[PDB]
Amino acid sequence: SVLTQPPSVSGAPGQRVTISCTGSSSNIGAGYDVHWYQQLPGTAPKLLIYGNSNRPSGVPDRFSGSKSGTSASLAITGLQAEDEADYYCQSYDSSLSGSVFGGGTKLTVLGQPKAAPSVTLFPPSSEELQANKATLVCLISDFYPGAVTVAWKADSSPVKAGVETTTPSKQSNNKYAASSYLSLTPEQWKSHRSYSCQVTHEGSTVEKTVAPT
Amino acid sequence: VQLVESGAEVKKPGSSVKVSCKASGGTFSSYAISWVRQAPGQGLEWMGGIIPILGIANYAQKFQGRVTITADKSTSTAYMELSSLRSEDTAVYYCARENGYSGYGAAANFDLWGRGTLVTVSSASTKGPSVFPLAPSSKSTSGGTAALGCLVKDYFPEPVTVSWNSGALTSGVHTFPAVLQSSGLYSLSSVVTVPSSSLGTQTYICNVNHKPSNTKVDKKVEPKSCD
Amino acid sequence: EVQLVESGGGLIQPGGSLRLSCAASGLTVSSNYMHWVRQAPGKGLEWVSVLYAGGSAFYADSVKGRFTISRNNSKNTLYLQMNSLRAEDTAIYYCARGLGDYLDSWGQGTLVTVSSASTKGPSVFPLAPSSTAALGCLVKDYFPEPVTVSWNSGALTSGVHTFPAVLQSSGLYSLSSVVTVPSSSLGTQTYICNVNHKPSNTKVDKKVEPKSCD
Amino acid sequence: DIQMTQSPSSVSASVGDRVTITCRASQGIGSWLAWYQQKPGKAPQLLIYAASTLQSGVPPRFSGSGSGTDFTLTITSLQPEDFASYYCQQANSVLALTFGGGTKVEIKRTVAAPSVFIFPPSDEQLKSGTASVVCLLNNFYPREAKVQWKVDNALQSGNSQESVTEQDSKDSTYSLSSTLTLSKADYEKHKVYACEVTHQGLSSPVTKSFNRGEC
Amino acid sequence: TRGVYYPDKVFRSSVLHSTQDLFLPFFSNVTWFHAIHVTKRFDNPVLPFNDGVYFASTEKSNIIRGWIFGTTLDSKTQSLLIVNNATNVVIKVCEFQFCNDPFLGVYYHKNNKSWMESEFRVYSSANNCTFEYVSQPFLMDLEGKQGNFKNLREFVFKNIDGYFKIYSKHTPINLVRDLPQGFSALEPLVDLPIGINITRFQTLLALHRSYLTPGDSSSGWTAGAAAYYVGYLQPRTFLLKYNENGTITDAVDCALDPLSETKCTLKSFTVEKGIYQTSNFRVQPTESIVRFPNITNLCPFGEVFNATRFASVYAWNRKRISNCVADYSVLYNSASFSTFKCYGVSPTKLNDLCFTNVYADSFVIRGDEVRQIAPGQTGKIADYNYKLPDDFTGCVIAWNSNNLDSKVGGNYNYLYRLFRKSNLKPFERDISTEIYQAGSTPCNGVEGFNCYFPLQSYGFQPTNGVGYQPYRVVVLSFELLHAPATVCGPKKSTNLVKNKCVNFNFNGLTGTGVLTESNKKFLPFQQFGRDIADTTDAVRDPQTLEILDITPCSFGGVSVITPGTNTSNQVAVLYQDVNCWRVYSTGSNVFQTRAGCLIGAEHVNNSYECDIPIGAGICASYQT
Ligand SMILES: *[C@@H]1O[C@H](CO)[C@@H](O)[C@H](O)[C@H]1NC(C)=O
């Protein structure tokens, strides 16, 4: 990942996006060429452009590349829904005495109708109290992957232990859903009066409070 | 042709791993075979490459003399034997097929790749999962729909196929992934949408199958009586 | 599944030019290393020249000059041309492919002979047996190689010891032939040896008698 | 720069014996030697390559093991068909070959005796102007046999050329003959001509001497 | 025709050499200093020391005792003191508090006829001293003479790199008041490493006191008869003649007259009748300056030459070195390399010139293949693995690596190409793993008959010979394009001087020219420009980013007509590209012809036969 790549780039369905991969003079600035690879999120990477001018079989004509001086370019004619992948530049390194890849770039072209986050709160059933543990699930649905900050409180002090953030999974209707867990004990479960889960999204805050007793 | 690798491997912090990359539809011929790893959140590295027609390996500077790569030419299968595993090494591994050419560049390009071998490090051993049922309350059932499901805890491996009524339910089912914890434990969730009119005539059960643990627990779910 | 055919060898005068033709079969002369290994008669093998897959050739120190190799891709035939030759250049020449340091596909051998003499008939002189016994005829001052010796028109085949030709100081070969015969049949059977060779087309039938009085 | 020398030249072994033929090099060469088997009257063929491997089609009897200087061509079982010469070959960085000496393997035979047969020149050769007198050697083994000529009880050097025939396929019998060339003027000057031999099979040397005046 | 010394200590016999150093101009207007009692002209002024002073002294009573060299002469800077009193020759280097009028006192007694030095008033005190030299004692005459001048002393002083050089030679003369004309080559006497900056110097004389000079110490003294002259040293080109004895007997000038410059170009003391190019208006250089980019980073030569691993022969690594300064002496003096045969470059000139970029190629190969790296070679390496062009710039570096690249067994970690159907292009590297074929039938990647891998392993056993040992090879490929250079050798950087004929050193090239401001606009990726005559006339000067046009000090193209050295010294000078200011001198009898302007020759209305060709039908002759 010595070869410099942007952390993330933005594209639109119909415009041109140029990605620059500039490295050191020992590997990129030398006579060695570049090799572009496309890695789908869930599929092994494959060779995209080799030799900086040729295209292997199965590669669409929209993908083009060039090299000038100490830089490499990846020109794509249009962006499709299947173009959401990480692109890497690979070149031979004289100092490292081996082939190395680039840092990678993120190309995300997507958009969803994000709405207000609808939250539901769930406490352990009576039979969870005999397991010497207490978990608190804060189920959240119909939201966006952005602004998934989760906060916990007991009406007197915020909780800073046992909190976590889970990466949401894609649904079948272009939606993302996740959940958060809070590890506690049955000894202190009955001490507090109420528990709530705080979710903040684009300034819209919703509060749900349950009563164990 | 195509390259076939092994399945997922789980090891210990300080054990030895041994994966294979078989070839289907044809041998490696005389092209050199390389090995490329890929970590989540990072780029792709290069441990080394093998020439199968001579059995000669060329390593990298970052990987010292603790990993040896061997490739049998008769069976057309390469190996990636590595020792002294570390918890950082939680990446997948691909076997790359180089394709040289003639020119001023002479940069090796990986034409054919593998399918990936997820190697993970976990000090915790295999234990028995425990499942408890969840039912909605009176206040949660404001409308005609209800939310309920089963959650899996103490399960070491995140991947666990969860089926509703042995696959009889396909609408409204959602699968949630695991998350890292303080002790390295994993936990998932699962919730379904059902009408309130079917809560007194049809029961819901969860069937969880754990292939490495050789266990299968059948548990019933009942609505709450106090609320 | 390999085969090599050599042609063009023969007799040439010293300080002359001779062109060889090395025909290949089963392989291409312009894609692998081609070697020219020459072995002297009665001596070991010796390297002379090599031809690479490209347009590069190397020759030994003794044959650095007056030597040229020019392969032809039209007929897949290897050619070797020497504008000048010396008296030490008479030997058997072999063209053979080599997979680097070692050779794998050899072939036949042409005979190149250099001499200032010409064709000359063989002078046959009998050897009188001393009074088992040995009898034969001596071939002296004949050129070139080879000649054949037959006894009683091929009837006698036991005890025949035909010595190989040896080059004398005058440049003309010599040969001796002897046959073991018993002393009881010296005065009964008559032994005549036939010497002939196609370069001169000379056939002489001389009988050999026991030693007589002075 | 490189002079390949082979220690053995003519070794005799039975069928159940190892010749142990070795080659030497001036400079160290690491496993880049090849061996050949050139039959008399036949083209040479490769036997081993890279001093450790074996060429396809070669019977699995010729082996070799040499790291940098001392190579070998030991054969576990000796067959009558592989009775030929051997050479050690090594190439330079450029393709300049350096073939070594020749080593011949011969079948063992009885020592017997070098039977001497004198032969005065005939009277037909008198008119030719050149006089040639030879003495014959037959059924002798090994090749160690002196053919030195004695004329008038004096040593003669540089006047005879040796001629040795090949081994027969019947009983492997050797034969030797030397031809002495002299002018007719020098033929009448001398009176005593003979050749003497020395061999292991003879307790004492045997010499046959004749005179120009005989009947 | 005076002041000529030996510029170098190299012995030359029957050869003529032209040098460039601080010499005395010929027929210069030297300053005259007189001191006659009669009157009372005791002149010891302070005059500058620009680049060197030629001293000519006519002495008869030894009135000059020493000289003072320094900068301020007020005990603030280091000063050089030389003196010759009645006893010794004392040379000391201290910070003296010099008086306004230093002198030496000699007293004469009427009762007994004897002269002895009495007063020594040169400096007040000396605190810190660095160099001191005292000669052997001797007795001097110091007796006044009623005759004319008899002894002539000539001194030449130079201060180059802190070294003080004194050249002296004594020649007897017999004159009254004149400069004795003649040739007397000065010999080296003593080199003093003072290492001080000298700007002004003052002459020191002696005082004579007796009963005939009444008064106090400031007025009761006489001066006697004395005379001395001072000539400056100007950097000019000269030609010197060395005979078998090794002493210079005569010399010619190259900057005095156009007739003198004919001898400099012809390298002879006799000028025949003909035409010579000479110069139009030649100004001798007075300084030498250098200019290089301000880069001060060291090039990473350690990584290339001390890598932990080396690339294969076929897959040789290529490294580009730029944006630094590279010193070629530390690698040369390592006493470990074994190959230094270079084509197109020189070890002495490697630190002067530079190129656009420097390429480094590293691999391991045997010595018999080390010598095959040269471009004029063929073979398995010199035609299939690495090819160098016939116009390759630079050289490779190889050294013994017996300790590394070898194990207990065979080291099969390095390979090389063996089979190839075509000749490799220069500066091309191939990494092909395809199965090589030789037969007519195609090979589908199998390892059967007539199908072998092109790569062949190398046996690097420790028991191999010297020529078969694996040698680490580093290839340096120098390429010089029209782009500005980003890497150059380690050299100093001086200041910039304008409107003077100076020696300029811009980006490795040196020459003579004048730096002037230019209004031309230059595209960024081009550094140097040339005129129609393919002469360099523009520099970029990346330090100041200002374009300076090289102005020739003298374009030449001036005809000089000489009737003959044996006949007369008068010559005729004809200017071709000048229409009748750019002349050596206006002179008289200026005539303008079609071929050019002729000066120094009288034009007549007659028409005789042509003696020497002039041009455009004009002819000249030497008549009465
Ligand atoms: C490489 O290392 C040696 C030993 O440390 C040193 O003498 C040599 O100068 C180094 N090479 C370079 C190019 O500095």
Side-chain angles (χ1 to χ4, degrees), chain A residues 1-113 115-186 188-213, chain B residues 1-215 217-227, chain C, chain D, chain E:
Chain A
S1 299
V2 50
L3 311 192
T4 304
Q5 291 261 81
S8 201
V9 287
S10 60
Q15 333 303 340
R16 193 157 156 275
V17 170
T18 293
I19 305 175
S20 267
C21 168
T22 81
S24 89
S25 62
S26 64
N27 40 66
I28 276 304
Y32 316 103
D33 302 330
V34 294
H35 300 305
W36 290 101
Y37 294 88
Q38 169 177 356
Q39 177 254 345
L40 302 198
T43 305
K46 71 152 152 63
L47 177 62
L48 187 59
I49 306 160
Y50 86 108
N52 309 17
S53 267
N54 307 357
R55 274 190 283 277
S57 34
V59 170
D61 219 330
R62 324 179 277 101
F63 294 94
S64 56
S66 87
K67 183 192 166 79
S68 86
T70 78
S71 82
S73 304
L74 176 85
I76 318 164
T77 304
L79 289 97
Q80 323 294 280
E82 259 209 13
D83 284 9
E84 315 181 10
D86 303 67
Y87 295 94
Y88 307 89
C89 42
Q90 173 250 335
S91 197
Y92 195 29
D93 208 336
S94 290
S95 302
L96 203 90
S97 296
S99 303
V100 75
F101 284 80
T105 168
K106 206 112 184 294
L107 189 44
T108 77
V109 183
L110 214 49
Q112 257 70 50
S118 303
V119 84
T120 52
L121 189 51
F122 308 96
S125 307
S126 310
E127 77 275 335
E128 254 303 350
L129 304 182
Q130 288 99 5
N132 316 286
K133 58 189 185 183
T135 206
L136 264 167
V137 48
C138 172
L139 183 76
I140 182 75
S141 302
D142 201 51
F143 56 119
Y144 212 67
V148 278
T149 76
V150 179
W152 295 81
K153 59 173 296 182
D155 309 89
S156 44
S157 84
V159 187
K160 297 301 145 194
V163 72
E164 45 92 8
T165 307
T166 314
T167 315
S169 41
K170 184 174 292 187
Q171 301 178 203
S172 317
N173 43 7
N174 302 92
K175 211 61 68 179
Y176 264 100
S179 62
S180 63
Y181 277 45
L182 191 73
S183 277
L184 286 178
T185 203
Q188 74 166 306
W189 164 256
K190 49 195 177 303
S191 56
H192 304 143
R193 298 314 298 138
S194 90
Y195 306 89
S196 198
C197 178
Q198 286 200 337
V199 175
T200 317
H201 180 87
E202 72 195 350
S204 64
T205 317
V206 285
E207 175 98 334
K208 181 167 292 300
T209 286
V210 297
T213 52
Chain B
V1 299
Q2 69 159 343
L3 291 94
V4 187
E5 292 177 350
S6 59
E9 202 146 0
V10 185
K11 275 299 177 297
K12 307 304 289 292
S15 278
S16 64
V17 82
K18 181 70 148 203
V19 303
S20 60
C21 173
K22 296 152 301 172
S24 178
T27 170
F28 293 146
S29 195
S30 59
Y31 305 101
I33 313 297
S34 295
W35 281 82
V36 172
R37 81 172 214 164
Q38 183 204 250
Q42 287 84 58
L44 301 105
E45 273 181 47
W46 184 78
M47 301 145 278
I50 326 171
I51 308 178
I53 207 154
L54 296 130
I56 293 180
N58 154 22
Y59 306 145
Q61 282 186 0
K62 195 179 158 320
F63 297 92
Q64 293 88 351
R66 81 202 178 110
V67 50
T68 88
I69 39 185
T70 54
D72 303 351
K73 190 189 43 154
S74 49
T75 51
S76 195
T77 282
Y79 296 88
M80 205 206 49
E81 167 69 57
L82 171 143
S83 60
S84 149
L85 253 176
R86 174 161 41 269
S87 322
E88 181 295 339
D89 303 302
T90 49
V92 308
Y93 302 91
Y94 312 96
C95 37
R97 210 268 296 265
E98 332 189 314
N99 166 262
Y101 58 93
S102 59
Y104 280 84
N109 52 90
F110 304 136
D111 154 40
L112 255 189
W113 287 69
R115 284 274 91 77
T117 44
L118 186 126
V119 168
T120 169
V121 195
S122 150
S123 67
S125 87
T126 308
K127 58 178 59 62
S130 47
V131 188
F132 98 88
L134 216 33
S137 315
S138 48
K139 295 180 182 297
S140 278
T141 326
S142 62
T145 178
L148 90 167
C150 312
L151 322 180
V152 195
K153 304 83 161 183
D154 310 353
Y155 69 99
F156 52 109
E158 173 173 357
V160 178
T161 324
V162 179
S163 88
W164 232 259
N165 318 130
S166 315
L169 187 128
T170 42
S171 48
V173 58
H174 293 273
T175 317
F176 290 81
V179 61
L180 267 309
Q181 284 197 339
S182 295
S183 315
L185 210 60
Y186 272 1
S187 283
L188 64 99
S189 45
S190 45
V191 280
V192 290
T193 282
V194 280
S196 294
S197 87
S198 69
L199 278 177
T201 166
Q202 176 143 10
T203 174
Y204 310 100
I205 53 183
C206 295
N207 180 32
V208 182
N209 297 164
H210 217 57
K211 322 291 180 308
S213 286
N214 314 332
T215 177
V217 47
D218 272 17
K219 187 197 54 49
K220 293 179 179 179
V221 188
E222 61 268 2
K224 260 73 178 179
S225 317
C226 56
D227 51 353
Chain C
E1 58 197 28
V2 84
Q3 205 210 17
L4 284 143
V5 162
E6 282 93 327
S7 178
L11 186 105
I12 205 65
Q13 311 281 330
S17 64
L18 181 74
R19 161 74 76 78
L20 276 89
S21 307
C22 164
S25 186
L27 88 183
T28 46
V29 295
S30 62
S31 161
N32 43 33
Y33 299 133
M34 301 305 308
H35 297 68
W36 276 95
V37 183
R38 160 209 69 185
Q39 166 191 231
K43 286 192 41 133
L45 290 150
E46 268 307 307
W47 180 70
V48 163
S49 76
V50 73
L51 186 57
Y52 293 162
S56 39
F58 281 95
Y59 326 108
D61 259 4
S62 82
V63 292
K64 187 72 65 148
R66 72 197 211 277
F67 263 73
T68 326
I69 322 166
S70 61
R71 55 181 191 203
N72 214 328
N73 269 305
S74 208
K75 315 165 289 306
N76 208 31
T77 321
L78 183 50
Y79 288 86
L80 189 125
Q81 161 93 0
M82 321 152 281
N83 40 277
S84 171
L85 283 138
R86 307 210 297 232
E88 81 206 20
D89 283 348
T90 196
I92 319 176
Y93 284 86
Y94 308 107
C95 64
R97 205 254 323 254
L99 327 167
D101 309 28
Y102 63 82
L103 311 104
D104 66 330
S105 150
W106 282 84
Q108 333 196 17
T110 37
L111 248 201
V112 192
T113 48
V114 281
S115 287
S116 324
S118 64
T119 69
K120 164 162 251 193
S123 322
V124 52
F125 308 115
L127 291 93
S130 54
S131 307
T132 166
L135 185 141
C137 41
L138 164 85
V139 193
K140 191 122 180 34
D141 267 8
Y142 76 103
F143 191 82
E145 190 85 79
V147 81
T148 171
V149 161
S150 275
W151 274 106
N152 251 34
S153 300
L156 221 63
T157 36
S158 295
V160 189
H161 289 134
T162 302
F163 293 98
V166 47
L167 189 102
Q168 290 158 114
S169 284
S170 150
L172 282 43
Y173 291 85
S174 179
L175 177 166
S176 312
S177 192
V178 279
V179 154
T180 45
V181 278
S183 36
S184 324
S185 190
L186 282 188
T188 301
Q189 205 92 354
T190 55
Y191 326 104
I192 307 171
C193 52
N194 300 29
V195 282
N196 67 97
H197 62 274
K198 333 281 200 203
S200 83
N201 203 270
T202 306
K203 180 58 156 284
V204 52
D205 282 87
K206 163 184 273 309
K207 318 181 181 181
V208 186
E209 274 58 47
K211 50 194 309 301
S212 35
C213 215
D214 185 25
Chain D
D1 170 65
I2 304 271
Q3 306 276 357
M4 317 275 302
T5 76
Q6 269 176 53
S7 166
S9 202
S10 317
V11 64
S12 307
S14 39
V15 284
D17 197 353
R18 302 155 90 257
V19 282
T20 60
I21 306 185
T22 170
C23 180
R24 217 69 48 83
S26 60
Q27 284 193 20
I29 306 131
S31 86
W32 290 118
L33 221 66
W35 285 92
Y36 299 86
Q37 179 223 5
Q38 174 205 174
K39 300 226 194 67
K42 257 82 139 193
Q45 70 171 227
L46 184 79
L47 275 188
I48 80 169
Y49 64 100
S52 278
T53 75
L54 258 168
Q55 185 67 20
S56 38
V58 166
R61 47 177 92 116
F62 315 97
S63 84
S65 50
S67 56
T69 307
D70 287 14
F71 300 86
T72 176
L73 205 61
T74 40
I75 318 152
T76 326
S77 148
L78 197 70
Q79 282 329 288
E81 79 253 8
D82 42 49
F83 271 134
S85 324
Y86 305 95
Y87 302 91
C88 43
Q89 178 257 335
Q90 168 258 321
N92 178 348
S93 310
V94 295
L95 282 203
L97 298 211
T98 315
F99 288 86
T103 304
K104 198 175 222 271
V105 184
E106 314 153 338
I107 327 167
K108 311 178 71 62
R109 202 40 172 79
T110 324
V111 279
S115 312
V116 153
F117 276 74
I118 202 51
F119 289 105
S122 304
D123 269 19
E124 184 136 324
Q125 216 191 3
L126 181 127
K127 330 156 209 148
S128 306
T130 318
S132 37
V133 52
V134 306
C135 70
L136 195 70
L137 286 187
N138 210 302
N139 57 265
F140 79 108
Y141 174 110
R143 274 297 309 267
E144 302 298 272
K146 216 69 194 303
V147 73
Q148 155 201 343
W149 274 74
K150 294 175 63 175
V151 171
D152 284 320
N153 317 326
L155 188 46
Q156 304 279 111
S157 64
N159 217 0
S160 50
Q161 297 211 326
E162 302 217 48
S163 320
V164 194
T165 195
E166 215 77 19
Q167 285 264 263
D168 307 353
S169 291
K170 20 173 192 163
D171 43 304
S172 87
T173 323
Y174 262 115
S175 286
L176 200 134
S177 69
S178 53
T179 309
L180 202 152
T181 71
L182 265 186
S183 88
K184 215 44 180 197
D186 292 353
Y187 186 52
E188 286 188 335
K189 197 157 55 201
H190 294 318
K191 206 49 178 203
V192 180
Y193 67 101
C195 82
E196 56 155 327
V197 294
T198 40
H199 226 302
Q200 192 175 358
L202 301 165
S203 47
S204 277
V206 181
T207 317
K208 266 161 97 203
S209 310
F210 263 31
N211 304 299
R212 310 210 296 98
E214 89 270 46
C215 165
Chain E
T1 64
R2 76 223 83 169
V4 173
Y5 48 84
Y6 302 118
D8 281 336
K9 299 174 182 177
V10 184
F11 186 76
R12 317 188 192 268
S13 165
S14 188
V15 82
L16 298 195
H17 193 279
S18 163
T19 83
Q20 167 63 34
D21 204 280
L22 296 181
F23 293 6
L24 167 73
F26 266 16
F27 290 158
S28 56
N29 190 16
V30 289
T31 326
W32 297 274
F33 298 95
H34 309 325
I36 309 87
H37 164 76
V38 167
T39 175
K40 210 60 67 192
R41 297 313 296 125
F42 218 83
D43 307 350
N44 42 314
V46 181
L47 75 157
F49 194 96
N50 163 264
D51 275 326
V53 162
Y54 156 71
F55 203 97
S57 172
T58 60
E59 253 187 334
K60 69 185 177 70
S61 297
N62 306 335
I63 211 77
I64 287 108
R65 302 303 198 91
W67 280 315
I68 292 299
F69 299 93
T71 297
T72 61
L73 316 166
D74 295 312
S75 79
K76 289 182 177 180
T77 49
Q78 276 211 115
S79 290
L80 162 70
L81 184 141
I82 58 136
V83 73
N84 200 340
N85 49 353
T87 60
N88 292 70
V89 181
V90 181
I91 300 180
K92 53 182 96 85
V93 179
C94 322
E95 316 193 275
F96 310 96
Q97 181 66 42
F98 287 123
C99 301
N100 203 11
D101 212 320
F103 65 97
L104 285 91
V106 179
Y107 195 78
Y108 178 54
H109 306 92
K110 192 187 173 63
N111 191 23
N112 42 332
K113 294 179 180 179
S114 176
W115 302 76
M116 180 217 60
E117 173 159 343
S118 298
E119 289 170 314
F120 196 90
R121 310 202 201 275
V122 174
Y123 59 95
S124 306
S125 54
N127 186 33
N128 290 330
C129 300
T130 53
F131 173 71
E132 189 156 342
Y133 162 68
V134 174
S135 179
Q136 303 283 341
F138 51 88
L139 285 179
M140 248 185 171
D141 203 4
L142 308 181
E143 184 181 2
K145 305 300 181 181
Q146 296 305 308
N148 41 3
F149 293 143
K150 274 304 313 173
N151 280 118
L152 164 83
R153 315 193 211 275
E154 297 177 346
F155 289 86
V156 156
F157 304 115
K158 284 155 71 174
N159 207 22
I160 296 173
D161 292 340
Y163 269 24
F164 206 78
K165 303 174 178 179
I166 301 180
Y167 308 135
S168 72
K169 162 142 192 53
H170 304 287
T171 298
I173 55 157
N174 200 3
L175 289 99
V176 180
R177 218 68 175 207
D178 208 275
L179 273 92
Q181 298 264 41
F183 214 99
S184 64
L186 310 185
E187 46 262 47
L189 183 72
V190 47
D191 211 327
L192 312 106
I194 37 169
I196 319 164
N197 183 26
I198 294 158
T199 44
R200 337 281 311 274
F201 93 106
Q202 185 169 55
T203 321
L204 318 176
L205 316 174
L207 255 72
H208 282 301
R209 290 187 180 180
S210 62
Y211 75 105
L212 289 168
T213 51
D216 48 341
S217 311
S218 177
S219 75
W221 54 272
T222 190
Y228 57 95
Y229 327 102
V230 165
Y232 283 104
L233 289 189
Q234 191 187 124
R236 298 196 322 174
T237 46
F238 263 77
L239 198 76
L240 316 178
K241 169 196 298 164
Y242 320 100
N243 216 18
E244 295 331 283
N245 209 348
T247 83
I248 306 173
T249 59
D250 209 13
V252 305
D253 205 344
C254 321
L256 169 71
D257 281 332
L259 85 87
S260 287
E261 217 178 273
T262 57
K263 304 178 173 144
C264 210
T265 316
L266 185 57
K267 275 187 179 288
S268 87
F269 274 66
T270 313
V271 170
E272 296 84 3
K273 196 135 163 183
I275 322 165
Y276 304 96
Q277 186 173 355
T278 73
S279 271
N280 180 270
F281 196 91
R282 169 200 199 184
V283 179
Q284 312 333 290
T286 78
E287 214 183 20
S288 290
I289 67 152
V290 295
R291 270 300 258 269
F292 264 122
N294 220 352
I295 45 184
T296 180
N297 204 340
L298 271 192
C299 289
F301 266 138
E303 186 56 49
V304 190
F305 286 88
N306 273 326
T308 173
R309 69 209 292 218
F310 257 41
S312 296
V313 193
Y314 65 101
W316 47 273
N317 284 343
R318 162 146 282 193
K319 266 192 72 84
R320 167 147 104 86
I321 296 183
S322 273
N323 180 24
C324 50
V325 291
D327 183 38
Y328 296 93
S329 324
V330 299
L331 56 102
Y332 191 27
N333 304 330
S334 281
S336 173
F337 296 150
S338 165
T339 296
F340 261 109
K341 314 130 172 182
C342 302
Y343 324 110
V345 304
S346 186
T348 84
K349 212 182 191 311
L350 259 184
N351 281 322
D352 183 37
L353 41 67
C354 35
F355 323 92
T356 317
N357 38 10
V358 173
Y359 291 115
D361 324 302
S362 148
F363 47 86
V364 283
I365 221 167
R366 290 181 272 134
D368 190 280
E369 274 154 28
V370 154
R371 50 145 284 263
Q372 223 173 7
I373 303 310
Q377 297 271 291
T378 83
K380 296 139 49 150
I381 286 307
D383 212 62
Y384 298 144
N385 283 259
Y386 216 138
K387 289 280 276 157
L388 310 189
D390 309 4
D391 54 331
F392 169 67
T393 301
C395 39
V396 317
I397 288 161
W399 65 93
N400 175 45
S401 46
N402 214 335
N403 286 340
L404 322 165
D405 263 40
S406 203
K407 329 151 87 197
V408 177
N411 189 35
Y412 298 95
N413 287 327
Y414 307 98
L415 292 73
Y416 76 112
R417 294 285 322 272
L418 196 49
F419 300 97
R420 219 195 198 275
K421 326 183 89 153
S422 277
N423 291 5
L424 192 80
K425 306 276 199 43
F427 280 134
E428 184 188 24
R429 153 167 34 88
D430 183 88
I431 308 161
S432 42
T433 41
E434 199 89 33
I435 281 290
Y436 193 86
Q437 62 155 23
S440 311
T441 87
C443 209
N444 41 304
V446 315
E447 215 170 8
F449 204 59
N450 266 316
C451 283
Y452 325 98
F453 206 53
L455 291 177
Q456 178 72 272
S457 204
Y458 261 136
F460 287 158
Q461 270 159 52
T463 84
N464 309 330
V466 167
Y468 276 16
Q469 263 137 39
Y471 290 162
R472 285 188 171 210
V473 188
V474 168
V475 178
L476 254 60
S477 159
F478 302 138
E479 162 176 273
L480 173 57
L481 307 117
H482 292 107
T486 166
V487 47
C488 282
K491 286 275 298 281
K492 304 312 171 233
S493 281
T494 54
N495 304 8
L496 207 67
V497 51
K498 312 299 229 80
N499 305 15
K500 280 173 60 173
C501 193
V502 81
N503 313 280
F504 64 110
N505 192 18
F506 276 105
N507 250 32
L509 54 80
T510 182
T512 79
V514 187
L515 304 173
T516 46
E517 203 36 71
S518 183
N519 280 289
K520 301 174 182 172
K521 261 68 188 152
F522 280 93
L523 67 169
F525 61 96
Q526 164 224 53
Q527 261 216 345
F528 278 71
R530 285 146 194 168
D531 51 353
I532 171 69
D534 301 319
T535 80
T536 298
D537 67 322
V539 293
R540 229 198 61 80
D541 214 354
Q543 290 204 329
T544 188
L545 216 75
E546 295 209 337
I547 288 288
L548 314 161
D549 47 301
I550 283 311
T551 308
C553 302
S554 185
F555 36 77
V558 172
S559 287
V560 165
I561 298 108
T562 305
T565 320
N566 189 249
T567 302
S568 172
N569 282 335
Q570 194 193 321
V571 294
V573 172
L574 172 88
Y575 301 87
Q576 324 295 110
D577 62 297
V578 185
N579 198 353
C580 289
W581 181 268
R582 302 182 87 91
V583 286
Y584 276 106
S585 70
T586 165
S588 75
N589 294 329
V590 172
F591 185 46
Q592 168 69 33
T593 85
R594 264 194 289 171
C597 186
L598 184 49
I599 68 152
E602 173 69 35
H603 173 60
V604 295
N605 284 5
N606 287 344
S607 295
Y608 311 108
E609 288 197 10
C610 208
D611 208 359
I612 176 171
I614 314 296
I618 306 300
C619 304
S621 315
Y622 192 65
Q623 305 305 123
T624 306

